[PDB]
Ligand binder design. Sequence first.
Ligand SMILES: OC[C@H]1O[C@H](O[C@H]2[C@@H](O)[C@H](O)[C@@H](CO)O[C@@H]2O)[C@@H](O)[C@@H](O)[C@@H]1O
Ligand SMILES: OC[C@H]1O[C@H](O[C@H]2[C@@H](O)[C@H](O)[C@@H](CO)O[C@@H]2O)[C@@H](O)[C@@H](O)[C@@H]1O
Length: 101
Amino acid sequence: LGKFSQTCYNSAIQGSVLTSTCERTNGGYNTSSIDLNSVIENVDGSLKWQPSNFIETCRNTQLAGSSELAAECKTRAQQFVSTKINLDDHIANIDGTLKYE
Ligand SMILES: OC[C@H]1O[C@H](O[C@H]2[C@@H](O)[C@H](O)[C@@H](CO)O[C@@H]2O)[C@@H](O)[C@@H](O)[C@@H]1O
Ligand SMILES: OC[C@H]1O[C@H](O[C@H]2[C@@H](O)[C@H](O)[C@@H](CO)O[C@@H]2O)[C@@H](O)[C@@H](O)[C@@H]1O
């Protein structure tokens, strides 16, 4: 499941939008973007795979490593702590286009 990083490169993240160049099944490269906001939630300090507008309570979203997304999110105590999530869990590349599965 996911692992889009095996056939995609030059991945970048700005705010909640993931943008990356992926290879097509029939050869050739395709570029696309998808809003992860509809699939990431903030649970008492940690980002989880569920819709809830996480960026509304999180800031400094940035790309970490090859497939990890690092950000800071508010805990119930109203404090920003370091949080991270593996994009490889559900973000896959189907025909050069990214699709959550
Ligand atoms: O690296 C192997 C690749 O294999 C599987 O995907 C296949 C196909 O469904 C894809 O459309 C094309 C790329 O466009 O590649 C394969 O033929 C998946 O397991 C994929 O995650 C993996 O990277
Ligand atoms: O916009 C709704 C908000 O709800 C959930 O977070 C709750 C709580 O855990 C937070 O500490 C405070 C703000 O600090 O807000 C809510 O009561 C999460 O799903 C969050 O992502 C979402 O933005």
